[PDB]
Amino acid sequence: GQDLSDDKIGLKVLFKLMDVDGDGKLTKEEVTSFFKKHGIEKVAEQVMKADANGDGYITLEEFLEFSL
């Protein structure tokens, strides 16, 4: 009876999992470690150019915005 999690349940899980600090937001450094798994460095320019708020970190929302 419990409503499952949006099809993006996987993305949300991984993101949160990478955030052992349970802050709900990943920092530039974190974004590099997560993407590092692919060996892609472009993630740095993408996360820096995607940060319109210059907060230096991305929350669940942002993480879901960077997937395509």
What is the smallest separation between the CB atom of 62 and Ca ion, expressed in angstroms? 6
Cα–chain center distance at 45:
14
Compose the 5-24 pattern: x for residues touching Ca ion by CB under 5 A, - for all others: --------------x-x-x-
The answer to whether 65 contacts Ca ion (rule: CB under 5 A) is: no
Q: Is 15 exposed, middle or buried (0-12, 13-18, 19+ CB in 10 A)?
A: buried
> Residue 25 and residue 3: Cα distance in Å, rounded?
24
Question: 30 labelled as ligand-binding?
Answer: yes
The answer to whether 31 contacts Ca ion (rule: CB under 5 A) is: no
Decide whether 2 or 19 has the Cβ nearer to Ca ion: 19
